[PDB]
Amino acid sequence: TTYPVLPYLTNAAYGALSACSTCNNPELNIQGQTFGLLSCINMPESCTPGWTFGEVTQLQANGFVVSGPSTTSGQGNYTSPYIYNDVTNYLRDEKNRPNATFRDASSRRLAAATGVALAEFLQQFNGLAVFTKNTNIRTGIIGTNPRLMLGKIRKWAQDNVGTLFSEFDNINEDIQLLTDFEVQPKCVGQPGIFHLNMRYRPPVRGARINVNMAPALFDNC
Amino acid sequence: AQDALSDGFVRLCIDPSLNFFGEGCKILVEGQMTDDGSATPDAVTCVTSELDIIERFGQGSVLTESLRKVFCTCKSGVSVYALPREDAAAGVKAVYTLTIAGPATTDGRVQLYMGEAEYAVDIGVDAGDTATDIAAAIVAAISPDFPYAATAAAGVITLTARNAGTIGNHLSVIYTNLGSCTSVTPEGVTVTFAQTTAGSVNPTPNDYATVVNECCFAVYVLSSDDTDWQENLRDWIRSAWDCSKPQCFGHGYVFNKGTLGQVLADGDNSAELSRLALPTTYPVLPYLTNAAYGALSACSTCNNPELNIQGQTFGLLSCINMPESCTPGWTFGEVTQLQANGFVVSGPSTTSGQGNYTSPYIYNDVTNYLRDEKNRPNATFRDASSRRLAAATGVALAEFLQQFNGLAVFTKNTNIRTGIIGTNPRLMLGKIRKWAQDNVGTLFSEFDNINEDIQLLTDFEVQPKCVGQPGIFHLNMRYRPPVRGARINVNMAPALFDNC
Amino acid sequence: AQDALSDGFVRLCIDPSLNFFGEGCKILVEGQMTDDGSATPDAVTCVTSELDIIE
Amino acid sequence: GNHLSVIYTNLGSCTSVTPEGVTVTFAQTTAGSVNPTPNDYATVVNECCFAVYVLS
Amino acid sequence: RFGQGSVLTESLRKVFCTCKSGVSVYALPREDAAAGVKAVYTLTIAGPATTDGRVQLYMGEAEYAVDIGVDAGDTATDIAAAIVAAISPDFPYAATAAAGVITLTARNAGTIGNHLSVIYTNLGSCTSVTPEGVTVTFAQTTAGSVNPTPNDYATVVNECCFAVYVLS
Amino acid sequence: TTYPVLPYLTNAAYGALSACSTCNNPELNIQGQTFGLLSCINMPESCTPGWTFGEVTQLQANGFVVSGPSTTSGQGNYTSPYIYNDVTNYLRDEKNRPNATFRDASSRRLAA
């Protein structure tokens, strides 16, 4: 309630920083004094910290982006607010089933990036005529079969490990390609329709590091 | 525009962002101020230099004098903050009566050590001067910064404390001229010192949570002897060292003046306070020595947190000057008993009967911490160096770990491609171990086994199945900080024989 | 709070549990005491040092 | 318009000394009222994708 | 949610202190019996103190221990007031001072209040010297009475399984 | 009878430790100074050991969980109670047939 800066200015800086990351690194979390520092905004420093840490924990618990001053002081300088957590207001599934798929703004940005990258890769099979998965397409023929399609998809996914996914528990069982004939009932599936299931592991945001310092002073114990 | 800048081929920006000054030495000096001051009570205010002390916090107040000592102690500090306090509503000012009897029959010098050496008076009494003239001379010679308004009345000098409360009850006027061989005191004149009334009700603010909300302070200096007020400051600094909320550490500096039994009773298990045990016969006004000690500790924090404010070189309160004596304040039995029960003992730099002034130095730089939460007598926060250095280590490790903030976290098998702002727990732990090994000899000692001392776990391998949250890490660091260094038991064994 | 600790990204705990002193040499000396002493008879009491023996 | 915070960031300052006399007080004599509710994104932003939407 | 200093509050505080970062702790708050009687203990202090010292008291658990500093000449009234002011608010016993007698009334009626053990863990201590004079005595002037008997688990916990039931 | 800690606190710590094991290792026995250490509870050390060993054996015989101080001393520190035996109050069958199927709390947790 006691927020000095006009709120839409801080909101615009936050959104602009998120966009200006999207353009470059979708996996980045707009968070902390380096990556989530709204340096254009400047608010006067105070010892009264806006949200108390109890309120900060309650807000971060209920999917709220909390922002705080970069420096606390009584000298009355100006400080730039930085984002504590780069999360969306998503807490729970369609079963309300508290879930963690879209908790991070990084998760939305990166699911968009992954969907678009996979779609642009799969667009290379558009126009190609599809043979059965036993046919060895002759050279000069613009064609492919589900086996070659799945091989190229798996190679693509393994190419994006460390860029768009983490590693793959089992890339063979994580990426599956079925024709519409082995999904639909007999004589009901349509030719040229495929079902690709990809169970990937995206990078996570990184929320807290609980550090437990244990000074050891004794030499004979 | 200007040639070579008018065509817009070269666009120039100055960027004065590197050259901003650091705060410096964040010491908060708290004490009572007189009504002459212009400062607003109950509000932490920056004190730039020693110039505005008298204007802001009163002329001759407790806070004025403690701030004067803080400024005399540290090098050129301007980040000294003050927290002025109002006198209690029903507070009673201590009144001492320095009664002088004459008349003088021979000439001589009358020297008096009142308060500290900064306030000493040195008047010349001629033969035939009545007690009235000598009292008038002493009053006219009393420094205005002395925290006691002096009024002469028929040879009795009434010294009324400038600040109400028990803080006025620690005045020691010493007629440091008796028996002197160089400065011959006049025949006749008799100086006697009585304290006709005692200090009473003290401030008990208990408003640190509001006044100092999140504005961290490396050192808190308390210029009051009230154990309730010291306890409030203790509770505040203990809250500042709390796992519950983000800790922004501190350390308190209070004094306890009294008999050995009284000083020991005033102590507790407070790792947050460095209690300064002062004897009943302590000449210097206690808050001055406390302020010098706290200012020295702060002025070390700014530079070397591992330093122990201790000994004649590093713990020498050179601003304070007390007259030398052969009676050593605390006897060594009392010194051992105080150092045993977590009390900072301070002693004269030199012992002599020549009656010079000596600067007190700190014997042990320890906190008033003896035992754990199981009472389990423990040694983690025994040293003030330990609190200062645990704060420094926590802040340094936190500022290092802040570099993983914003980075997206992959699994510990993923080889992050270049250009991706990311990391995995393996790279995180490698960088943390490199950081810790980089601070060996600066912030830690060596590492028994740096691999088994620093462990990083995800929240998935700590919490039950499907209960841990992604992106949460648990870092356990078992480090070895430098220890203070308390005693060197030297055992000399002269060998005189050649054939044995 | 303090910078790098205010955003709650790094939560810090000190844990002074390693540095607790061991008891040492558990020897119980039993003997008669004079009435000048302040100790309560028939009660095992820790004796810290040689200072308080006479008292 | 209901989120203006004027702070007289000069009170008690040691460097910039505020004048004696002058008193600054901040009151908000009236409150904001009815806001826009467009609800026309389907028409205005039909298929023109946008990575980030900022709402002021 | 469950009251300040209640039995359920303290047992839940211990459940949360024990397990790692558990949030699936469920609670089943119960009302005090209609005619329930709160246990009353009287920690009576006699003085005055003649020497300084520390007065430490283990009441309840170590989380509730008090450690006050008694100066010489403090009457039993001042020491009782200090101990009351030092009693933690989470202690399941409301403390009121009266002329040096500290009345500790259980926050919850029933027999559950009948298990308070205040130990003056300072007597004979070599490090923390208890003040001369001061005498701490602990009496329990009244006993707990009628307890809750819900017997409604079939309705309250119908099929919502629970690995562990803790009864306080 | 002379138990210093408020009893429901020790009971809550014991139950919370048992639950916090269930979530991970149902076969674990909340027992001993490592796995059955109620570290949140802290009671003052004493030489008078609550239950004497005769009473300890009689209680453990009749299916009672006995808890004792982690350390015994006269120095007057605080000690955390740990659980001696992690058993249920089950001794005998439906024929009274003294049986051992559900003697351990581990047995109930692990049968579940």
Coordinates of N, CA and C in Angstrom, one line a residue, chain A residues 29-37 49 51-53 55-61 64-72 80-87 205-211, chain B residues 214 244-248 394-395 397-407, chain C residues 1-12:
Chain A
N29 N 15.5 -16.2 -15.8 CA 14.5 -15.8 -14.8 C 14.7 -14.4 -14.4
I30 N 13.7 -13.5 -14.6 CA 13.9 -12.1 -14.3 C 13.8 -12.0 -12.8
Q31 N 15.0 -12.0 -12.2 CA 15.0 -12.3 -10.7 C 16.4 -12.0 -10.2
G32 N 16.4 -11.3 -9.1 CA 17.7 -11.0 -8.4 C 18.1 -9.6 -8.8
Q33 N 19.3 -9.2 -8.2 CA 19.8 -7.9 -8.4 C 20.5 -7.7 -9.8
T34 N 20.8 -8.8 -10.4 CA 21.5 -8.7 -11.7 C 20.5 -8.9 -12.9
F35 N 19.7 -9.9 -12.9 CA 18.8 -10.2 -14.0 C 17.4 -9.6 -13.9
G36 N 17.0 -9.3 -12.6 CA 15.7 -8.8 -12.4 C 15.7 -7.4 -11.8
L37 N 16.7 -6.6 -12.1 CA 16.9 -5.3 -11.6 C 16.3 -4.3 -12.5
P49 N 10.4 -1.9 5.2 CA 10.6 -2.6 4.0 C 9.4 -3.0 3.2
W51 N 6.7 -4.7 2.1 CA 6.2 -6.0 2.7 C 7.2 -6.5 3.7
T52 N 6.7 -6.8 4.9 CA 7.5 -7.6 5.8 C 7.7 -9.0 5.3
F53 N 8.8 -9.6 5.9 CA 9.1 -10.9 5.3 C 8.0 -11.9 5.5
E55 N 4.8 -11.2 5.1 CA 4.0 -10.9 3.9 C 4.7 -11.3 2.6
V56 N 6.0 -11.2 2.6 CA 6.8 -11.7 1.4 C 6.6 -13.2 1.2
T57 N 6.8 -13.9 2.3 CA 6.6 -15.4 2.2 C 5.1 -15.7 1.8
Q58 N 4.2 -15.0 2.3 CA 2.8 -15.3 2.0 C 2.5 -15.0 0.6
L59 N 3.1 -13.9 0.0 CA 2.8 -13.6 -1.4 C 3.5 -14.5 -2.3
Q60 N 4.8 -14.8 -2.0 CA 5.5 -15.8 -2.9 C 4.9 -17.1 -2.8
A61 N 4.2 -17.5 -1.7 CA 3.5 -18.8 -1.6 C 2.3 -18.8 -2.5
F64 N 2.7 -14.8 -6.3 CA 2.8 -13.4 -6.5 C 4.3 -13.0 -6.7
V65 N 4.6 -12.1 -7.7 CA 5.9 -11.6 -7.9 C 6.1 -10.5 -6.9
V66 N 7.1 -10.7 -6.0 CA 7.4 -9.7 -5.0 C 8.7 -9.0 -5.5
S67 N 8.7 -7.7 -5.3 CA 9.8 -6.8 -5.7 C 10.3 -6.1 -4.5
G68 N 11.6 -5.9 -4.4 CA 12.1 -5.2 -3.2 C 13.3 -4.3 -3.6
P69 N 13.6 -3.4 -2.6 CA 14.7 -2.4 -2.9 C 16.0 -3.1 -3.1
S70 N 16.9 -2.6 -4.0 CA 18.2 -3.1 -4.2 C 19.1 -2.9 -3.0
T71 N 18.9 -1.8 -2.3 CA 19.7 -1.5 -1.1 C 18.8 -0.9 0.0
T72 N 19.0 -1.2 1.2 CA 18.3 -0.6 2.4 C 19.2 0.3 3.1
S80 N 16.9 1.1 -6.9 CA 16.1 0.4 -7.9 C 15.5 -0.9 -7.5
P81 N 14.2 -1.1 -7.6 CA 13.6 -2.3 -7.2 C 14.1 -3.5 -8.1
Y82 N 14.3 -4.6 -7.5 CA 14.6 -5.8 -8.2 C 13.6 -6.9 -7.8
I83 N 13.4 -7.8 -8.7 CA 12.3 -8.8 -8.6 C 12.8 -10.0 -7.7
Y84 N 12.1 -10.3 -6.7 CA 12.5 -11.4 -5.8 C 12.3 -12.8 -6.5
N85 N 11.1 -13.0 -7.0 CA 10.7 -14.3 -7.7 C 10.1 -13.9 -9.0
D86 N 10.5 -14.6 -10.1 CA 10.0 -14.4 -11.4 C 9.0 -15.6 -11.7
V87 N 7.8 -15.5 -11.0 CA 6.8 -16.5 -11.1 C 5.5 -16.0 -11.7
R205 N 13.4 -22.8 -12.4 CA 13.8 -21.4 -12.1 C 14.9 -21.3 -11.1
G206 N 14.8 -21.9 -10.0 CA 15.8 -21.8 -8.9 C 15.3 -20.7 -8.0
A207 N 14.7 -21.2 -6.9 CA 13.9 -20.4 -6.0 C 14.7 -20.0 -4.7
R208 N 15.3 -20.9 -4.1 CA 16.0 -20.7 -2.8 C 17.2 -21.6 -2.7
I209 N 18.2 -21.1 -2.0 CA 19.4 -21.9 -1.6 C 19.4 -21.8 -0.1
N210 N 19.0 -22.9 0.6 CA 19.1 -22.9 2.0 C 20.5 -23.3 2.4
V211 N 21.3 -22.3 2.8 CA 22.7 -22.5 3.2 C 22.7 -22.7 4.7
Chain B
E214 N 14.7 -2.3 8.9 CA 15.6 -3.2 8.2 C 17.0 -2.5 7.9
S244 N 14.6 -17.0 11.0 CA 13.2 -16.9 10.5 C 13.1 -15.9 9.4
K245 N 13.6 -14.7 9.5 CA 13.6 -13.7 8.4 C 15.0 -13.6 7.9
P246 N 15.2 -12.9 6.8 CA 16.6 -12.6 6.3 C 17.4 -11.9 7.4
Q247 N 18.5 -12.5 7.8 CA 19.4 -11.9 8.8 C 20.1 -10.8 8.1
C248 N 20.1 -9.6 8.7 CA 21.1 -8.6 8.5 C 21.8 -8.3 9.8
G394 N 28.7 -15.1 6.0 CA 27.3 -15.3 5.5 C 27.0 -14.3 4.3
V395 N 27.5 -13.0 4.5 CA 27.2 -12.0 3.5 C 28.0 -12.3 2.2
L397 N 29.2 -15.3 1.2 CA 28.6 -16.5 0.6 C 27.3 -16.2 -0.1
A398 N 26.5 -15.3 0.5 CA 25.2 -14.9 -0.1 C 25.4 -14.1 -1.4
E399 N 26.4 -13.2 -1.3 CA 26.7 -12.4 -2.5 C 27.3 -13.2 -3.6
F400 N 28.0 -14.3 -3.3 CA 28.5 -15.2 -4.3 C 27.3 -16.0 -4.9
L401 N 26.4 -16.6 -4.0 CA 25.3 -17.4 -4.5 C 24.3 -16.6 -5.3
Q402 N 24.3 -15.2 -5.1 CA 23.4 -14.4 -5.9 C 23.7 -14.5 -7.4
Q403 N 24.9 -15.0 -7.8 CA 25.2 -15.1 -9.2 C 24.4 -16.2 -9.9
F404 N 23.9 -17.1 -9.1 CA 23.0 -18.2 -9.6 C 21.6 -17.8 -9.6
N405 N 21.3 -16.5 -9.2 CA 19.9 -16.0 -9.2 C 19.6 -15.6 -10.7
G406 N 18.4 -16.1 -11.2 CA 18.0 -15.8 -12.5 C 18.5 -16.8 -13.5
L407 N 19.6 -17.5 -13.3 CA 20.0 -18.6 -14.1 C 19.0 -19.7 -14.0
Chain C
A1 N 16.5 -6.2 5.9 CA 17.6 -7.2 5.9 C 18.8 -6.7 5.2
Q2 N 19.7 -7.6 4.8 CA 21.0 -7.3 4.2 C 21.0 -7.8 2.8
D3 N 21.6 -6.9 1.9 CA 21.7 -7.3 0.5 C 22.2 -8.7 0.2
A4 N 21.6 -9.3 -0.7 CA 21.8 -10.8 -1.1 C 21.1 -11.7 -0.1
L5 N 20.6 -11.1 1.0 CA 19.7 -11.9 1.9 C 18.3 -11.4 2.0
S6 N 18.0 -10.3 1.3 CA 16.7 -9.7 1.5 C 15.7 -10.3 0.5
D7 N 16.1 -10.7 -0.7 CA 15.2 -11.3 -1.6 C 14.9 -12.7 -1.3
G8 N 15.4 -13.3 -0.3 CA 15.1 -14.7 0.2 C 15.6 -15.7 -0.8
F9 N 16.4 -15.4 -1.8 CA 16.9 -16.4 -2.6 C 18.0 -17.2 -1.9
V10 N 18.7 -16.6 -1.0 CA 19.7 -17.3 -0.1 C 19.1 -17.2 1.3
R11 N 18.7 -18.3 1.8 CA 18.3 -18.4 3.2 C 19.5 -19.0 4.0
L12 N 19.9 -18.3 5.1 CA 21.1 -18.6 5.8 C 20.9 -19.0 7.2

